[PDB]
Chains A and B, each alone.
With several copies, the nearest count.
Chain A
């Protein structure tokens, strides 16, 4: 009966003007359906390349939704457990043997049981409950004690971002991880994705200070190492200083008792940036439950995993 601040027709024609063009079909079924598609193709190239108003019209009409790269790995189905969550940040340990048809990756629970086997709360019992034997992952890695003696464990672990597609097989499980770009679902349709980090290995740097990048942090504690995950919206180049300050109350306090030799053991931990999620969406705590018990878990949506290099603290 009255007039709105917006007419529907003007908004309708504005949306129709700013609409992307349809993707070009090409029927390989019938030749009568093929000649119209190839005529549309040659007319599209003609009106997109001839020097007239049609070229600049179609050039402004184009929008640039690029698909991210994906990492296809083959891991042992016994060295993995498919009961874990989808969006878990995997860590491909570098295998020096070229005579290896498969590779080996690591969920944080697996390297957590590796650090606990090298030497807690509920997550250590959850990791013992998920991966029942640390001996499997212990003899999966060839040189664990030696490479942690020389402290080059960090460049032998390359983070491959979160896990999205994970099939389930008897032998030789295949996993698919997004490495660069936005996390998204590839085989299962491209709707939504999350990143599950264990909350006990994930601490907020800015809450300790009291975009949104995410940092993976190895530390070499003097009885055996540990991973921790750091979220901070601060600088890409001013993350080393604040984390140096954060690990300062521990380093000499447990480093008074140790002294190196045959020189190694000076590098105290190393840190890479897994990538960035948006400052709009925060991280929402949830619960990760195996069939024995449950564990708190942190969900991070809309990630853009851009894995950097490990940087020593």
Chain B
């Protein structure tokens, strides 16, 4: 099991960059397989294209990751992520995320600005942007928020009375966190592969909308007729037309089994579409030195 994988450069890494590269030791970097381009995320996230956060997410999820351990001049070494090994990762990322509960860590592209996780390489004509590491639920809500903006920018633009384009830019806004709110970067056009992901998600959504369990409709109608639950607060004591008109029929035992069976297989397929990108299960994160020991989950 080899880990010490050097990446040979071709020019002199000057001392203006050696300082900030030694500043970023213990972070995570994605691999190509070395050559000076394609080792990082600047090969797929350039300034020429829109920051789409899906094609670079595809490059993060397709190819493996690596810890940066030492940066010499003219060459730097990398340490791979093979499973079964406990890797120690420092939190060296400018939007800070405190790992109190020590959940499963999760890689992300720099959706909180290119400028915090970039490094300027003037040795060779290449720029390297670091992936963002953060726990799983914040990562999943970043995914859902960036796809919601990528599907809703077009339909807010599509209205002729676009009196509120800035409504979603604050409504989505920051990320949802208690101790501090962290604003992110929002692209106007979702690009090709983001739209392919929404296309597959729309495929799955319209297939599962062909089978709805009618039994929960009776329970939510009863909870409307009963006291207003705090989880029901999104309805504000209103029965919409759709839930009022999907309940003209009866409730039986025949449809429910096949409904919930195909809902089991399609929700497992949706988890497989949301098990997206490589994740790191975390045990024994020592806060006093900020090292989260992880094996490849």
The answer to A–B direct touch (Cβ < 8 A) is yes
Q: Do A237 and B179 have beta carbons less than 8 Å apart?
A: no
How many Å from the CB of B50 to the closest CB on chain A? 20
B58 at the interface (CB under 8 A from A): yes
**In the complex, A12 has a CB within 8 A of chain B:** no
A109 to B182, CA, bound (A): 36
The residue in chain B whose Cβ has the minimal distance to the Cβ of A270 is B265
Q: Known: A97-B179, A256-B235, A263-B211. Contact between A237 and B103, CB under 8 A?
A: no
Interface contact A158-B235, CB-CB below 8 Å: no
CB nearest neighbor in B for A72: B284
Name which of B1, B86, B207, B283 has the most chain A CB atoms within 10 A of its CB. Answer: B283
Q: Does A66 contact B (CB under 8 A)?
A: yes
Given the complex, which residues of B lie within 8 Å of A251, measured CB to CB? 232
CB neighbours (8 Å) of A92 from chain B are: 101
- Majority secondary structure of chain A interface residues (helix, strand, loop or mixed): loop
Residue contact B100 to A312, C-beta cutoff 8 Å: no
Query: A69 — which chain B residues lie within 8 A by C-beta?
Result: 86, 283-284, 293, 295
The stretch among A27-35, A163-171, A194-202, A240-248 that forms the contact with chain B is A240-248
Give the chain B neighbours of A188 by CB distance below 8 A.
none
CB of B89 within 8 A of chain A?
no
- Is there an interface contact between A180 and B1, defined as CB atoms closer than 8 Å? no
What B residues does A256 contact at CB under 8 A?
235
Contact B104 A309, beta carbon cutoff 8 Å: yes
Q: Contact: A103 with B284, CB < 8 Å?
A: no
User: Are B283 and A235 in contact (CB-based, < 8 A)?
Assistant: no
B86 surroundings in chain A (CB, below 8 A): 69, 180
**The 8 nearest A-B residue pairs measured at CB:** A252-B235, A235-B62, A158-B103, A96-B179, A179-B283, A69-B283, A235-B61, A96-B178
Not counting A160-B103, A237-B276, a sample of 9 additional A-B residue pairs whose C-beta atoms are within 8 angstroms of each other reads A98-B179, A179-B284, A238-B58, A238-B61, A238-B62, A240-B269, A240-B272, A263-B258, A309-B136
Interface residues, chain A, CB within 8 Å of chain B?
64, 66, 69-72, 92, 94-98, 103, 155, 158-160, 179-180, 211, 234-235, 237-238, 240-241, 244-245, 248-249, 251-253, 255-256, 263-264, 266-267, 279, 306-309, 311-312
Interface residues of B (CB under 8 A from A): 1, 33, 58, 61-64, 84-86, 100-104, 136-137, 178-180, 196-197, 200, 207, 210-211, 231-232, 235, 258-259, 262, 265-266, 268-269, 272-273, 275-279, 281, 283-284, 293, 295, 297
Can you list 14 pairs linking A and B with CB atoms under 8 Å apart?
A: A69-B86, A69-B295, A71-B284, A95-B178, A96-B179, A103-B101, A158-B101, A159-B103, A179-B284, A248-B232, A252-B232, A255-B235, A309-B104, A312-B265
